[PDB]
Design a protein around this nucleic acid. Structure first.
Lengths: 106, 198, 97, 95, 82, 198, 98, 80, 109, 95, 198, 198
DNA sequence: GGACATGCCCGGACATGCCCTATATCTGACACGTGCCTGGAGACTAGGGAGTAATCCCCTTGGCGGTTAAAACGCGGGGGACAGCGCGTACGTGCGTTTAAGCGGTGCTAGAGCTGTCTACGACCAATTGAGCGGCCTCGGCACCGGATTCTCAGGCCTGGCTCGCGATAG
DNA sequence: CTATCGCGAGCCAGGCCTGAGAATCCGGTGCCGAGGCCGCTCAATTGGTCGTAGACAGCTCTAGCACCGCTTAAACGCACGTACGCGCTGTCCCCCGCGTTTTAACCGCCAAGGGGATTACTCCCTAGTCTCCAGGCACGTGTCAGATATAGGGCATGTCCGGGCATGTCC
């Protein structure tokens, strides 16, 4: 029987795949055993946060399936995610429904 | 009037008879006929169907005339006409003179006569044979005052006399029925029928 | 007959197109422009469908963002109408001009 | 039969963990894959540069942790470091 | 050889782009500047894309070439490959 | 009108009969026919299929005409037409005059007549023998006012008279059916069928 | 009466003077005290190399000069001359720092 | 503390002059101070992070050079 | 044994081919590096150095200075459209800025 | 005697003497030149590595370097650099 | 009418009041007054005594005028007049125009006015101080239609306005009362009084 | 219309207010007002009394105008007028144009205006103070279509705007109320009041 | 006068409008299953990179003093920010026309992509040595300074020209 | 007495000259950092070997291009009205510029210590290889969800009429 490092760690992203991608990315001649575990774990965390917010936005929109619009809403409405993705354009995301106050009628 | 129109039933050569619908005695039925009384009870200005039955078809040019007279002998010489109020009100159908009691509805060829010698009013239409696949011809009369109209019929009963005439006015046949024009034909018909037993 | 006040339909269109996600530039003229510019860089180029869609998504995002910044600069000057000088200021401050 | 590389099954498991009632479209899946690959490249590159600058030839967890602290915002960095440390400690105990 | 395709970027398209950007009113003089800006963008992006294509010994610009060009210009685009 | 069109059934030399679809009496029914009443119940401006059946094929040039008349005898002389509201609304199909109650849909060779002598409206199309697969030719009528339209049919029942005619409008056959144009054909059909037992 | 230049002549003179030269314009020691103060809010008892503070100071002055260039361009765009906080906020918003 | 006042009014005026402005509103100075302070928070954060990763107790010029480079503005003249 | 001569001399360049090659090998860029890559890289670096130094020298003589200072380097970089583009996001220490006054700020008669 | 610290100072001086025989260099300016050369080095080597990776190439050649130079350098600068590199590489290969 | 006559009670300088007899309510009574309703109930053409009371004697040439108006506000502008029937019947007393509702009986000096500007009818007599030994002057009015006459008052209640006026027609005093002209004054008075409790 | 008349309540200098009768909600009461809804419910062509109250008397020459508008904002610019059927029927009182929804009954001095600029219909009469005893002036309106008339109000609610104007037509005061013209005012009033709780 | 005679009004209730919702069917786009194969997991090996400890020195921190240039503060004023107003013109909105964008089907061939082979080419390793860096010394860039010379721009005064007012002469 | 013309005086504008600040130039000393030279050392060069990777050939088969046809929605041209950009004007306030006081920044000089860089020893941690196996990724079969339209189902609200009241009539 073979049991994987992700299974021993209780995580969802594959330790082996992240490890291989680090080994083949021409980044360093050696890679420690804990580095791909840490990296994979951070990726789960960030994915869970983004999917959490996108799901919330979908439910607010009475949608059961997340669409790119919901991803854009999630990234732009969250202050820290928008900072992290400040220079990132999501396709079919649109923009936030933001109107300047001076442009509203009197 | 100088005269009184005959009211004698005369079926004549063509076997001329009248027929009427079987309408019941609902308090305010628009028009109901009493076989017991030979009397039509109807509302003012409402449709009153009268059927013309013949054993054989009269010649083309045959006309059908209707005339009212008072039924009581002492009133017989008085011309039956509309009261002053209804005469003046604005209800003419564009065809009938305002003072005529009896109108025919739905017939462009209707003529209204004011007899120069007798002073009687009458309304005449061409006789139309029933479709060869039919039994009778129906004429639709309207009575334009209530029997009770003051200054008019003033609660005196009338007869309607229906005459079958040739082109010239020659008597081919005659029939008649009593008429009460009233607000509640069914009520009044039942009352008079009950009173027959009294 | 009936006539809408200046400004209501503009705002309605803004809300309409910011609520939805369909592309606003026509496919065929964009492709034609891209191909025209390309002839002067390399001859007889072929372009993938997803490549033209990529250029169009990038272009529309860039122009929408530039128009956002232009609008902010115009409103800053107590104006509503965008001017060429507004575009030039936005691009200069962004650091590409 | 040209094998490719995507995180589709793992993204779907995490989604089912956080929301086991929501699906995802192809365009949205493409956006998630682009996002994860971009993050990966950014973090791995910063960790690589960190290691080179410090004359380190091995990729270890301390450079990964520092790179995460540099790239992620405040609360995101703190929560990511906490989850990474707990997970690495549990794995190390589990061997 | 395609000629005068710049006129295909119509006035209402630029107006729609401005609406999505939050612009309420657009001067008639806006359009030529916008067209120039668009053209500039294209000459830079396409130059990088074609450069990559030629290095790869290809004659067809691929989606990955464009996405990579955009990334190396800081305008990274999601949805066409990572 | 000066006259009333005959309504007598006449199958004639060609054995002309009408047929109708078997639509039930439900809600959302746009056209349903009652064999018990020989009456079509249909919605305004909805398709009303009427089948023409013949024992033998009439000559080329034979036409099919439809005309409405009021069913009640006292209204028979009144031309059936659209009410003032529908007459004015903008629903003409480019072929039918605005005041015609009865239209034929899907026939470029349709003619609408306003009879100079009788003042009757009618709609006529060329007779075409049945299509391969059918023993009848179907014509699709539209009725453009509800029976209840005030100023129009005003709740009076009508008959549709379908005549098979020659080029010179001579009579080859005639059939007819009652029509109620209404919002709920199924409801109203069941009501009138129930009332037959009352 | 003593001599006095009209508003602006002396402003332009200092502009020319400070744009011709490269010597630092912000005081070393107060900036140094600020940097150490701000730093203890991240890590206590931190030390600084001299060349580290000089690097931070060079970076700060270059950043401020560029920001003031952009602010001036935005002010001139609005047919104004005197810069105000909303000008700074517009310049930083358009740059993508906000 | 009070040390933010050590970047004095004439210092902000001089920096603004090198930025080419002719007139400076009274409300400018606090705004400039805030902007400068935020910049410092971000730079010093990155610098100290680098210093701690190297297991050092003193922030070096090279730490600052890396912080500035990663902030998106490369500084020449201090090594690297 | 043949007399030792360097690849930079063989290529007519001044930058060290050996050192650039070593830095490419040890920069964790790839496991394998061709012989011509460091030659090409050295040539591009030498070219850019020669143009920047040329312009800085021009500026220095325009200022009647014989020694290149950072100010001259900054002036040279900013006065060249292509160098300014290449170094758009670079700040030169002790470089100052280009002398430039917007027309609206100048006095009027 | 401190540790071996590499720099381009002597090479910058040799090029300077080629282009300006009677011009010197200050230490601050030489430091700026070293920063510049190292920055360009990092940009070109990194872009070439990325280019090679993108194309599943395991060897660093001259084509990726030249293409990277063309991407990073402006038009006429790129043409002159490419011309110089090709002449230099062909002359080296002749040896 | 272009106007409505004022109905405000105004006793004026001479202390002008009305009085009425104490007639009871036998259903057949010809004229009976209800103090509870300030309403006269009277039969058509029957004598209706109205007493004029004054505290002091108005000058010679003083006249007394009576006019009817509809009591309900929406009918106030409609001139009160006889119905078409009673207008035409032959009951004029030689003094009163046929269309005037209100007459005065037993006074040769009565005048009937048809106002050229207001179109109102009225009847006027000279005021006479009471006969020696009397405390009031009685005027005898006749009402010449029933309140129910169709084409006339048509079941609408009226007021009678009695005015004391000088020789130029200027107002000296005014009083009024409601009137119902009906077949059974006593019956109808008791009915309306009973309904006060309802 | 190019414009919409203001509906803002404005009692003005004369303290102008409206009042209404206390009619209950019997199924078919002719006209009944709902204080809860500020809405009149009335039958077609029936009398609708509206009381004008003022704190002090406006000058001679003052006029009272009534105009209908649609209550729903999207219909406000559409001129309220009679439906094609009632427009054509023969019910004009000799004073009102056939297309005007709102008439005044019993006033010879009524004027009907068809505004050349706004295209709005209105009906205006001279203001008349009450007699010094009385406390208000009543005007009687007739509404000449049902709210439901197709091609007319087509089931859209309307407001009646009552304005007090000087002799030049300048504004002195304004009030308004909602109107439903319907067959069963009492039924419909109770239904809408009940729905207030829903 | 009581008992009917006879019309009118309207609440009951049906006729028959219209929307209102719910269920079923059809169309479109998407979760999960399967087989395989190749990339990940367990095990063993070497070796070298990293952890740790001692050392040294340099370079960072802290203090004292002066002194002077810069920062802080007061105050006058002028010019620039800003609010208000008028206008005219350029842009928003709507409508009829036309134009081409979009969609669906179909072809074919160019070219992306995969596989096989092999040879050129780059990693690796040992010996050499000469290029490059640290340290020391010196002289010239050149600034740093200060003081006289040169000088452009601004302000003030004087002169000339034009306009207005007053007086004189002529009609 | 009034009007017109001429002369004189006053005011405004333009030009020229003088003053004054700022810059240029000249010399001087001097200083300290850049350039050069020399020892050394370690990193590049050269020569040889070996694995491997990518250059080229060749085959497949995907998708990009080209075209035709139909539709219809978007673009376009124009008419028109009006809201906003822009120019102008007035006001007042608040920032500049300069004089005076203060203070703390800087330069120099010295002391200490602590931590950063260096070297040496060790050990354990990860690449490399092998063997195996299971997870992940093309291919695929049907199914599930949403929208739309048809069946119940409510209200939405007019017309007719039986009942019951109103009111005339008379032996």
């Amino acid at each position: 029987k073979a049991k994987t490092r992700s299974s021993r760690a209780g995580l969802q992203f594959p330790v082996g795949r992240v490890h291989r991608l680090l080994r083949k990315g021409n980044y360093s001649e050696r890679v420690g055993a804990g580095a791909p575990v840490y990296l994979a774990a951070v990726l789960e965390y960030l994915t869970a946060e983004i999917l959490e917010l996108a799901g919330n936005a979908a439910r607010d929109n009475k949608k059961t399936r997340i669409i790119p619009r919901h991803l854009q809403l999630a990234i732009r409405n969250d202050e820290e995610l928008n900072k992290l993705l400040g220079r990132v354009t999501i396709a079919q995301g649109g923009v936030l429904p933001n109107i300047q106050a001076v442009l509203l009628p009197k | 009037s100088s005269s009184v129109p005959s009211q004698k039933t005369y079926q004549g050569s063509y076997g001329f008879r009248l027929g009427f619908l079987h309408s019941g005695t609902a308090k305010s039925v628009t028009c109901t006929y009493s076989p017991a009384l030979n009397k039509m009870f109807c509302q003012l200005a409402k449709t009153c169907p009268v059927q013309l039955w013949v054993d054989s078809t009269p010649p083309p040019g045959t006309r059908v005339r209707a005339m009212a007279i008072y039924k009581q002998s002492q009133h017989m010489t008085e011309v039956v006409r509309r009261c002053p109020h209804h005469e003046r009100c604005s209800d003419s159908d564009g065809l009938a003179p305002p003072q005529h009691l009896i109108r025919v509805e739905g017939n462009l060829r209707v003529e209204y006569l004011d007899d120069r010698n007798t002073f009687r009013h009458s309304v005449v239409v061409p006789y139309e044979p029933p479709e060869v696949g039919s039994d009778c011809t129906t004429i639709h009369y309207n009575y334009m005052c209530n029997s009770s109209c003051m200054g008019g019929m003033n609660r005196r009963p009338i007869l309607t006399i229906i005459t079958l005439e040739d082109s010239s006015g020659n008597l081919l046949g005659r029939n008649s029925f009593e008429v009460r024009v009233c607000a509640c034909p069914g009520r009044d018909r039942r009352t008079e029928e009950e009173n027959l037993r009294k | 007959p009936h006539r809408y006040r200046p400004g209501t339909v503009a705002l309605r269109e803004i809300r309409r197109y910011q609520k939805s996600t369909e592309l606003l530039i026509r496919k065929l003229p964009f492709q034609r422009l891209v191909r025209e510019i390309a002839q002067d860089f390399k001859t007889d180029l072929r372009f993938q469908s997803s490549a033209v869609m990529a250029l169009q998504e990038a272009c529309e995002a860039y122009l929408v963002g530039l128009f956002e910044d232009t609008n902010l600069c115009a409103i800053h000057a107590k104006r509503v109408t965008i001017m060429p000088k507004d575009i030039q200021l936005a691009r200069r401050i962004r650091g590409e001009r | 039969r040209s094998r490719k590389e995507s995180y589709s099954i793992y993204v779907y498991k995490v989604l089912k963990q956080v929301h086991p009632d929501t699906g995802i479209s192809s365009k949205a899946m493409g956006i998630m894959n682009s996002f994860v690959n971009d993050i990966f490249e950014r973090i791995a590159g910063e960790a690589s540069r960190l290691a080179h600058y410090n004359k380190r030839s091995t990729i270890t967890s301390r450079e990964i942790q520092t790179a995460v602290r540099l790239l992620l915002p405040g609360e995101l960095a703190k929560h990511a470091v906490s989850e990474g440390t707990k997970a690495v400690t549990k794995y190390t105990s589990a061997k | 050889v395609l000629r005068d395709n710049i006129q295909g970027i119509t006035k209402p398209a630029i107006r729609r782009l401005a609406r999505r950007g939050g612009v309420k009113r657009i001067s008639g003089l806006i359009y030529e500047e916008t067209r120039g800006v668009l053209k500039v963008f294209l000459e830079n992006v396409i130059r990088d894309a074609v450069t990559y294509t030629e290095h790869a010994k290809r004659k067809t610009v691929t989606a990955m070439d464009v996405v990579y060009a955009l990334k190396r210009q800081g305008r990274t685009l999601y949805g066409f490959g990572g």
